[PDB]
Structure formats: C-alpha cells, structure tokens
Design an enzyme around this catalytic site. Sequence first.
Site, PDB file in Angstrom:
ATOM      1  CG  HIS A  40      23.996  42.425   7.491  1.00  0.00           C
ATOM      2  ND1 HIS A  40      24.489  42.008   6.390  1.00  0.00           N
ATOM      3  CD2 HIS A  40      23.469  43.742   7.339  1.00  0.00           C
ATOM      4  CE1 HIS A  40      24.374  42.892   5.475  1.00  0.00           C
ATOM      5  NE2 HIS A  40      23.770  43.909   6.050  1.00  0.00           N
ATOM      6  CB  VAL A  57       4.443  56.508  -4.464  1.00  0.00           C
ATOM      7  CG1 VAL A  57       3.062  56.712  -5.140  1.00  0.00           C
ATOM      8  CG2 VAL A  57       5.057  57.931  -4.131  1.00  0.00           C
ATOM      9  CG  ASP A  84      25.318  38.672   5.773  1.00  0.00           C
ATOM     10  OD1 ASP A  84      24.319  38.482   6.438  1.00  0.00           O
ATOM     11  OD2 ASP A  84      25.688  39.731   5.298  1.00  0.00           O
ATOM     12  CB  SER A 172      26.114  47.479  -3.064  1.00  0.00           C
ATOM     13  OG  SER A 172      27.351  47.072  -2.509  1.00  0.00           O
ATOM     14  N   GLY A 175      21.604  50.293   2.836  1.00  0.00           N
ATOM     15  CA  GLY A 175      20.167  50.384   2.471  1.00  0.00           C
ATOM     16  C   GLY A 175      19.975  49.321   1.377  1.00  0.00           C
ATOM     17  CB  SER A 177      22.189  45.237   3.649  1.00  0.00           C
ATOM     18  OG  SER A 177      23.306  46.088   3.853  1.00  0.00           O
ATOM     19  N   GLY A 178      21.277  42.869   1.640  1.00  0.00           N
ATOM     20  CA  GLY A 178      20.272  41.792   1.444  1.00  0.00           C
ATOM     21  C   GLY A 178      19.810  41.643   0.020  1.00  0.00           C
TER      22      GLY A 178
HETATM   23 CA   LIG Z   1       5.271  51.663  -4.197  1.00  0.00          CA
HETATM   24 MG   LIG Z   2      29.913  47.921  -0.591  1.00  0.00          MG
HETATM   25 ZN   LIG Z   3      24.591  46.321   5.720  1.00  0.00          ZN
END
Ligand SMILES: [Ca+2]
Ligand SMILES: [Mg+2]
Ligand SMILES: [Zn+2]
Length: 223
Positions: A40, A57, A84, A172, A175, A177-178
């Site tokens: 996804h 940075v 997924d 989790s 941001g 995800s994966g």
């Molecule tokens: Ca960096």
């Molecule tokens: Mg979760």
């Molecule tokens: Zn997600």
Amino acid sequence: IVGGYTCGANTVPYQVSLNSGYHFCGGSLINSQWVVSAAHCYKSGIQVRLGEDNINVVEGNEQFISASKSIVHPSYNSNTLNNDIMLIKLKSAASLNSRVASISLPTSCASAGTQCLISGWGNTKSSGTSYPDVLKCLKAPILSDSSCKSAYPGQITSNMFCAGYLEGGKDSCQGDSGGPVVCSGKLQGIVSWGSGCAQKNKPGVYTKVCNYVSWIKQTIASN
Ligand SMILES: [Ca+2]
Ligand SMILES: [Mg+2]
Ligand SMILES: [Zn+2]
C-alpha cells in the site's frame, strides 16, 4: 511510533525511508540491491534513502538511491490489505557498512510471545499529529492470533499477525507503514494497518513475512 524511544543514529541499519519528495513510508534492506516494504506504499517515483537517522538533515551517512523497479505481490488486495508486501529494486547497489546493513529473512515463523523491534518515522501521538525527524523504536511482542482476531473480527488472514499491547499506549502509526518488525534477528513483519494508533484493544497488524520467503527469493533472482 507512539510510546517508543529514539533508537539512536543508525542502530536499525536495515531501516530505509522511501521518499517521493518527502518521506512517506519505511522499508527494510534485504541485500545490496533489494528492499521489501508494504504494497500500500506503492508510488511511482521512489527514491530510497539508507543510513538515515534524521530525515530532515543530511548528516553524512546517507545513501539516496532511486528505485529501478517495484513489484507488488500478485495477490495484493487493497481493500482487505491481504498480501500487503512489495519489493523495490535499487538502480545501483548500496554500499553496506556499519550504518547500512541488510536484515535476514526468516527460516520459520515466530511464536506468539516473541519480542520484536518495530521502527519508523511515523506519527508519535495517538490523539494528535507529531512527526519526529529521528528514528523511533518500539519493542513489542507478537500477540496470539485469538486476541488479534477478536480485535478485528473477519479481517485477519493467515498472512497477518498482531503485535503490540492490548492496553494500548504503544503502537506503530501512520508514517511507519512498510517498516520492519524484526524478532530474533529475522524480518518477521511489515507495518501494514491498525485501528487509529495505540488504542486499547486495537493492536497493529503486520504482514507475516515467513509466508512469502519463497516468493521473495524467486522474484529477486529473476529480476
Ligand atoms: Ca539524514
Ligand atoms: Mg497500528
Ligand atoms: Zn499505512
């Protein structure tokens, strides 16, 4: 990641940040030329950033490599999020060093009770939006399938598992995800979905990597 801690610069060396002008998903380096993330998170125009700690940075240990190709799992269902998983090939091979290392794929699946390490640059508030610039970590155990299925009736398949705390507080979040869920030195999960973040009786759901090892191995060897 909510209720986690700052990992430390480059302490999760296999962690990657997928960027399309901004960080939108995490991933795991499995060898010098391939990354595994969630289907996804598929986008066209991905640049993989390795050796990252602060994503805002450039501190000297990064490698920004564009992806040459993406392969989403043949049976990915974006409505149920079943299967997924996706593989991303790097246009150039990354230079593995202390700060950039690959993670091993599992030989067997992990048992409920096993403690894992989940990491990412996602939201850190359950009720609010706070996006961190440095990598956050969370140690969380794999939950029994019975508690995973009671929390999400009719939604969990054999390709998913839950990890976290039913009391809520730690989890989790978007941001993340994966990203990776590593247990006993093996990549056992991919951050996939959940119900809001760190809510009570709503643990996060992860893609069960032990079920795709043959697909991963065969696909990378033929691409
Ligand atoms: Ca960096
Ligand atoms: Mg979760
Ligand atoms: Zn997600």
